[PDB]
Amino acid sequence: LDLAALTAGAKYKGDFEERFKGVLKEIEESKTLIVLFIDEIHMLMGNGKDDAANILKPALSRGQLKVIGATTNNEYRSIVEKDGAFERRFQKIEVAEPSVRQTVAILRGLQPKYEIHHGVRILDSALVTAAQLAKRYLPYRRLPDSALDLVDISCAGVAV
Amino acid sequence: QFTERALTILTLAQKLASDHQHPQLQPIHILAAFIETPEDGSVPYLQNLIEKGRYDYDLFKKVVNRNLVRIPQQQPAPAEITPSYALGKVLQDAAKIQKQQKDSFIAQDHILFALFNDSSIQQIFKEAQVDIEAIKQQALELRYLSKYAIDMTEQARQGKLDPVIGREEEIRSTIRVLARRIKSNPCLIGEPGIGKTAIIEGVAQRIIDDDVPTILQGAKLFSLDLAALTAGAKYKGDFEERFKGVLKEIEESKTLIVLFIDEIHMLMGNGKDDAANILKPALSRGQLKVIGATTNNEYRSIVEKDGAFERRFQKIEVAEPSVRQTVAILRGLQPKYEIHHGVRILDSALVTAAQLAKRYLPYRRLPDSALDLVDISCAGVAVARDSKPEELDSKERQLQLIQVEIKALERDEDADSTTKDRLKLARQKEASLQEELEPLRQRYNEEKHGHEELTQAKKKLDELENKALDAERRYDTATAADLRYFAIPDIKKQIEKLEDQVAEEERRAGANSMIQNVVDSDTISETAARLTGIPVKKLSESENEKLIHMERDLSSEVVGQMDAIKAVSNAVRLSRSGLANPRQPASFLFLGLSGSGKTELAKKVAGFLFNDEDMMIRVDCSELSEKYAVSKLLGTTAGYVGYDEGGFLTNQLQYKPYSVLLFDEVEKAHPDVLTVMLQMLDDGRITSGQGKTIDCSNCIVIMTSNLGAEFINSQQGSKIQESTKNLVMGAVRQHFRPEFLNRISSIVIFNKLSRKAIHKIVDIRLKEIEERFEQNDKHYKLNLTQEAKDFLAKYGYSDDMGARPLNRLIQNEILNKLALRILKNEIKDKETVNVVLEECLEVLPNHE
Amino acid sequence: LDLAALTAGAKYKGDFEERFKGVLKEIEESKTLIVLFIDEIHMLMGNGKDDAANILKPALSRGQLKVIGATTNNEYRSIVEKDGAFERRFQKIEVAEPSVRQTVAILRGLQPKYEIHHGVRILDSALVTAAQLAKRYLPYRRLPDSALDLVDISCAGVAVARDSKPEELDSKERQLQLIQVEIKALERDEDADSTTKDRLKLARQKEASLQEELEPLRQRYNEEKHGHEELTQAKKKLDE
Amino acid sequence: LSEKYAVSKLLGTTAGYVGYDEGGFLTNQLQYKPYSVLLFDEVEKAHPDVLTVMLQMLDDGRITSGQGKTIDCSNCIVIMTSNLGAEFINSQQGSKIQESTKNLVMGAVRQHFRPEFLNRISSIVIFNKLSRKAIHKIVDIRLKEIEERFEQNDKHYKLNLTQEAKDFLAKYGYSDDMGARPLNRLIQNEILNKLALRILKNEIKDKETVNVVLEECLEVLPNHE
Amino acid sequence: EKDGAFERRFQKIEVAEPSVRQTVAILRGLQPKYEIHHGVRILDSALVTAAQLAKRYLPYRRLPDSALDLVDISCAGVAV
Numbered sequence A: 001l002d003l004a005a006l007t008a009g010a011k012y013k014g015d016f017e018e019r020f021k022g023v024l025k026e027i028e029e030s031k032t033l034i035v036l037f038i039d040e041i042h043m044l045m046g047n048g049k050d051d052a053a054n055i056l057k058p059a060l061s062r063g064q065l066k067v068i069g070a071t072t073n074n075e076y077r078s079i080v081e082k083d084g085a086f087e088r089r090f091q092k093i094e095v096a097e098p099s100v101r102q103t104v105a106i107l108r109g110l111q112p113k114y115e116i117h118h119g120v121r122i123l124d125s126a127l128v129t130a131a132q133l134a135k136r137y138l139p140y141r142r143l144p145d146s147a148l149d150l151v152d153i154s155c156a157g158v159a160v
Numbered sequence B: 001q002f003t004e005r006a007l008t009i010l011t012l013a014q015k016l017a018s019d020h021q022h023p024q025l026q027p028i029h030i031l032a033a034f035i036e037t038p039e040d041g042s043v044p045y046l047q048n049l050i051e052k053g054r055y056d057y058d059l060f061k062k063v064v065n066r067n068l069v070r071i072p073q074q075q076p077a078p079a080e081i082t083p084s085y086a087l088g089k090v091l092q093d094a095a096k097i098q099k100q101q102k103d104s105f106i107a108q109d110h111i112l113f114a115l116f117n118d119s120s121i122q123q124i125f126k127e128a129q130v131d132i133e134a135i136k137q138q139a140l141e142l143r144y145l146s147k148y149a150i151d152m153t154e155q156a157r158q159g160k161l162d163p164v165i166g167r168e169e170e171i172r173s174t175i176r177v178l179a180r181r182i183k184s185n186p187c188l189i190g191e192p193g194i195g196k197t198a199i200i201e202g203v204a205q206r207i208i209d210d211d212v213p214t215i216l217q218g219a220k221l222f223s224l225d226l227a228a229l230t231a232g233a234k235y236k237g238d239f240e241e242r243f244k245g246v247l248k249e250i251e252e253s254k255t256l257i258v259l260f261i262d263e264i265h266m267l268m269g270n271g272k273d274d275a276a277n278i279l280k281p282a283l284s285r286g287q288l289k290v291i292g293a294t295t296n297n298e299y300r301s302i303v304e305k306d307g308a309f310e311r312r313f314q315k316i317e318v319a320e321p322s323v324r325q326t327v328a329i330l331r332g333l334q335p336k337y338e339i340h341h342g343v344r345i346l347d348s349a350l351v352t353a354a355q356l357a358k359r360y361l362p363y364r365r366l367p368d369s370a371l372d373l374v375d376i377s378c379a380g381v382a383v384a385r386d387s388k389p390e391e392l393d394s395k396e397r398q399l400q401l402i403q404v405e406i407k408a409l410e411r412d413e414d415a416d417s418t419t420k421d422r423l424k425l426a427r428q429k430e431a432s433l434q435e436e437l438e439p440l441r442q443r444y445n446e447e448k449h450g451h452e453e454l455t456q457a458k459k460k461l462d463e464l465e466n467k468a469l470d471a472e473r474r475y476d477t478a479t480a481a482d483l484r485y486f487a488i489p490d491i492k493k494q495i496e497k498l499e500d501q502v503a504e505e506e507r508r509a510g511a512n513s514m515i516q517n518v519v520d521s522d523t524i525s526e527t528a529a530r531l532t533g534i535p536v537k538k539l540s541e542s543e544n545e546k547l548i549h550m551e552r553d554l555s556s557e558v559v560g561q562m563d564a565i566k567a568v569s570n571a572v573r574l575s576r577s578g579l580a581n582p583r584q585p586a587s588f589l590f591l592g593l594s595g596s597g598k599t600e601l602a603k604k605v606a607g608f609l610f611n612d613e614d615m616m617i618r619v620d621c622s623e624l625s626e627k628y629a630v631s632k633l634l635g636t637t638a639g640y641v642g643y644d645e646g647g648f649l650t651n652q653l654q655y656k657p658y659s660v661l662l663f664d665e666v667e668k669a670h671p672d673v674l675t676v677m678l679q680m681l682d683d684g685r686i687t688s689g690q691g692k693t694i695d696c697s698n699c700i701v702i703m704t705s706n707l708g709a710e711f712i713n714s715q716q717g718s719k720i721q722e723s724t725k726n727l728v729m730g731a732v733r734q735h736f737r738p739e740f741l742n743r744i745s746s747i748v749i750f751n752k753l754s755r756k757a758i759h760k761i762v763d764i765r766l767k768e769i770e771e772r773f774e775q776n777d778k779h780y781k782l783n784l785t786q787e788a789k790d791f792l793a794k795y796g797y798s799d800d801m802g803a804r805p806l807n808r809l810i811q812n813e814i815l816n817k818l819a820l821r822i823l824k825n826e827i828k829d830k831e832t833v834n835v836v837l838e839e840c841l842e843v844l845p846n847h848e
Numbered sequence C: 001l002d003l004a005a006l007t008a009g010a011k012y013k014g015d016f017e018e019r020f021k022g023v024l025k026e027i028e029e030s031k032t033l034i035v036l037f038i039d040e041i042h043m044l045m046g047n048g049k050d051d052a053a054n055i056l057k058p059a060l061s062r063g064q065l066k067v068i069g070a071t072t073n074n075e076y077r078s079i080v081e082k083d084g085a086f087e088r089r090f091q092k093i094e095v096a097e098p099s100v101r102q103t104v105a106i107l108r109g110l111q112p113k114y115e116i117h118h119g120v121r122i123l124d125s126a127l128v129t130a131a132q133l134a135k136r137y138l139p140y141r142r143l144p145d146s147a148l149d150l151v152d153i154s155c156a157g158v159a160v161a162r163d164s165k166p167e168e169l170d171s172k173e174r175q176l177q178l179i180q181v182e183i184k185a186l187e188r189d190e191d192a193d194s195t196t197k198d199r200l201k202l203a204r205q206k207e208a209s210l211q212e213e214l215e216p217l218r219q220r221y222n223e224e225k226h227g228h229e230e231l232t233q234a235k236k237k238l239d240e
Numbered sequence D: 001l002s003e004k005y006a007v008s009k010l011l012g013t014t015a016g017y018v019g020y021d022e023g024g025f026l027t028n029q030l031q032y033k034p035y036s037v038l039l040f041d042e043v044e045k046a047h048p049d050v051l052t053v054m055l056q057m058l059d060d061g062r063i064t065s066g067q068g069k070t071i072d073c074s075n076c077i078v079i080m081t082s083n084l085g086a087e088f089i090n091s092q093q094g095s096k097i098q099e100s101t102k103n104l105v106m107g108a109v110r111q112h113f114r115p116e117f118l119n120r121i122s123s124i125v126i127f128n129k130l131s132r133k134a135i136h137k138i139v140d141i142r143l144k145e146i147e148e149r150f151e152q153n154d155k156h157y158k159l160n161l162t163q164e165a166k167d168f169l170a171k172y173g174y175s176d177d178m179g180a181r182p183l184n185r186l187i188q189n190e191i192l193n194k195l196a197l198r199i200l201k202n203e204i205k206d207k208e209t210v211n212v213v214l215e216e217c218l219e220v221l222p223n224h225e
Numbered sequence E: 001e002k003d004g005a006f007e008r009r010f011q012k013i014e015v016a017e018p019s020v021r022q023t024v025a026i027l028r029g030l031q032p033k034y035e036i037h038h039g040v041r042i043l044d045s046a047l048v049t050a051a052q053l054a055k056r057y058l059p060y061r062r063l064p065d066s067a068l069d070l071v072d073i074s075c076a077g078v079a080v
Ligand SMILES: Nc1ncnc2c1ncn2[C@@H]1O[C@H](COP(=O)(O)OP(=O)(O)OP(=O)(O)O)[C@@H](O)[C@H]1O
Pocket: A084, A085, A086, A087, A088, B162, B163, B164, B165, B166, B167, B191, B192, B193, B194, B195, B196, B197, B198, B262, B329, B367, B368, B371
């Protein structure tokens, strides 16, 4: 539930409350045990706020509305320092960075996607090397993204 | 059939027929019932659908009163008589409305519509109820707090609220304060997560329990803040507008409302600036009953900076429950957890959770974490129901793979050839799995149903109990009696019969493998470990046994020094048992050679007793004079530069209360420090520059010494013998005051140990060194042979510096030699050791 | 006229000032001697002034603007120093803590307001005591208020105690209810005919005994409540 | 203690100097202790100016903290300790301090502490030697207290502090010349410890007994181990 | 300290504080304003003592404030 949900699908003062207490109300009942999530995630600090409870607490309390949230480490601290009620409603989960092995496994699973994306052959050792390099030259950047970007950028390059 | 509101009105309507002694109840009496009295909270009369519609409530009343006069007043025998056919119709019509509206109980509002439709005050001075459009719009609009607060007392009234346990006085304390005519707002003071809102929930319960003084009893209770404080703003005053809104709305209609504030620290007043908190003292006499909340730490700074808060709110302290109290709380919640999760829970798991949760959380509250440890662990067991699809799917999945093979191979020509007709064997496997799957499936269905029914019965019991509790506190002796009159005893019997259906079997202590149960510390330690890391502490062992198993590892890991280990072990066990006076931290004097491993012994002790070698806190006592301050415990006195008090040791001790502290070459310490040491050797309330003490208890303090190193050098046994160890103690007696020696748990004497076992250390380090290379395994052909065993123990390991030089020889003769040939691309994989008498590596590839 | 008056409605530069000037115009015209007041005047001015009322107001130091403000010790010092205008535009009035005797007189003046609110009675010596105790034991809160905290809190203690009196009644009523409910269970049974549940006759001796105590305990309770209420209401009516 | 006697004592911190929370140890904690008591350990070792600082607590209790704030010392009792007159106390003139002996004691303190301070003390109290004639009550009473709490109580030691047990304490424990603190030392090093040697092995269901051996030492109780 | 622009537009003029005697002269000039203000008479000597005494009294007031304060205050006192 996002983007349009946040702003883009509306344009008047008060529309937030109307689409919020509308789509959420629809979600809250009958049509399966709906679990929602946010893609802009930190966004609850703006998409909740006055409605930090209303977004979920009474919808859960009255039935089954559940959500899967997310936040960066800094944003987590911020939502807690700002509100903290989220630590009564939600359960904090750490998400790991994969090892080079795991990264490569991911790349291998998606390797044909990448080959399809550009009509380019990709060496298995390029997934290994890209993962090794990404950690070695950009250790502070997400390994699987960096490894992939290195590949998708270079794939695009040769395609050009 | 009817709501509490409708019942109130109809009770009143029937009452009025008898109060005015009328021949029958009429629509007029119901209208009069709605006009109970001109109460500010009078939804059907002062705030009604007519006043906010078309006609004046006061005049409407006068017409109704005239009609009450017009309906004849009779003697008690002819008085009242009946509800009347007229209202049999109105109330049945109200019931029809309920169906139209999807509402299971009759609303007084529905009565207003049915009632109004029959009636008609056709005066030229019409008071006839405004018609249906105004009436309905206003009805639909029935019922700032709705956007910024939770009505805790109504929640409590409806049940579905955890019982508050271990806060009975705190609850009463706030009620007492609220009764005050001025400055009647209590503020809960204490760490977050201590149950400070449990008190508030408890107050909500006291209100519905009618334990609250009448002056407060008639009030409502709300949970506020954040929504009107920190949620967000675009402009100056956005929060303050919401404050004023609530601060004044509270003075209209709704009797008296008690509010609750989650955190005063968020209010404070931003340099006052006509903001936030500054608006609260403004109404500290102006009703605004409110219970506040903050922490001990912030409270002091809030008051010091504000100057008014302490005269607006009362300082009500709240503290964490003891482990036993925590368990009592958990026990009250134990059956709730069982029905919440669909699992069974051992009482010992609550005990474990409270004990364990406290032990592993220097930075988190016990009741918070105990409640999560239990809710998580029992959720874990609820998740464990996965056992049903786990076993069934592992097999069914294979079955499906087999079925795919079957349809795949049947649809062929080679299907007739034995090439694929051997497929029939796949069909045998399909069938075999189906034969296993059916009794597994039915087993699981039975197991599921067993727990399911048990749970449902428990839920029914709890709701009957909630009804009984409401009936009792509201004095509905009829309902309470019926619930006690076997309704509750019978559901209990059903639960017991369901326990018979649990049918604990000798081979399965509960006929339900889906519900593993929260099994004591197995489930709880596992859960805690999954949440926090996996310590030795996870084990269901006594302090002595955990220690002893680790002592055996300690004895094995340390080369020689077994005598030293045993001396320490004995004292630690004395301390772990509580027999040693708890005020005293264990402490030892490690007397031996420099380079002897004394430090490592202490580190291993940390490695075991506190499960972490790196928690070791160390003190250089040789670089030490009369000014001993920051580098130690004392810090400089605040009021003097050196604010980082006890920067090195105090900080580590206070952030690692369970650890080991070393005094490296303590015999070199300045005499004044040694008197501090006496302080440090007992009575763990060791002072510091800020005035706060250490309270050293669970930190072992180990002083080390080379004072008698020369006697140890005598080599009088691989374990030091009499006439040698007595001389190192002699030197200790000469140097250290008896006063120090009389506090130290033990003087611990170390031995000189030759390469016969030090070589093991060398090998261990070599293993660590190659193994720690996180990114690879170009393992040596570790041809140490005798030449490296002695080279490393001859030009390396020193009687005065131990392994320090081994590490350096290895770095220079092995790793630096290796690094170069790696860069030369002379290594593809592995490498050859070639000690040449000093030491070197051979290149495994031919300089490739 | 402060706080909520000033900034609860102030979002944009100019909103506070509009609200404030609106009022200044109103008070300066037609309506006799309007006198305003401010409690913690420290709130005014701001860190660099930037006219949080205090730059606009001085004109009216000649042109009327009668305002009673209030402050304390050092916050006063710091704002006087930073201001230098309001500083000169008002008379400094030191307000000394009243003597203990004056405090008692205050407590006496307020005695009926405490008794009426709480629905309690107090002793005159209680008033004397609170003033003295506050002087002796609360040296961080000045007398009037400190002594009143002791009075209000003490009265609250009593008010709660009054409202806790139903506990004596409840210890008897709870037994009674356990009994009438258990009798329903014992009587509405087949074992009711059996001597097995005939024990309900003893349960009935007990509900009767409890009622025998509860009646006069309750008559007493109600009358005691009436004593509080009639005194409360009478005092309320008198003051009215 | 030196002129620095700041947060850790009375001076606290003042504007212009490091640290804000101030007078911590005494005046801050006292600020939050509406009634109290104090103890001054080896007060004669105190800096002499500080000895006179104490006059603000001694009477007219307006301690002047680093911020110029006070605690108004009033409903409190302060105990200062010293051994300057020990040379006369140790005269052994009975088990009660005597005339002249006590005057020499007052001499010693007035020649050290300013008398302008000492003369304002409610009283100077001279402790008497106790020795065996009453120390034999300290032993045993203190031990019972240790055992009264024990931990779980079940396994506590029923006292068997025979005259021999008390003799060990008399010979080594009652160090009337250096302090009888060795009694506490011995209870833990001999009793809690040697019983621990069996308790720690879980050889005891409940209760406990200590027997004595002379060269003071304890016997092994052959009910356990 | 912050501007510099207005400085090229205006002439800085220090305004001197009047002496006690000069202050008395202002009190005399305003004397009829005060007598009219409250409907009271004031002695010339009062204007004089006010100015001198005010200096002694109020280190936080300039002579014209301190003097006018005593005069207007006294007149107000008398008005009661
Ligand atoms: N004694 C008790 N009885 C019942 N429930 C309790 C008790 N103590 C604690 N709890 C529960 O444990 C938790 C601790 O409550 P507390 O109010 O201290 O949390 P908090 O400080 O409000 O944190 P937050 O700001 O994330 O709501 C609460 O969720 C409360 O329901």
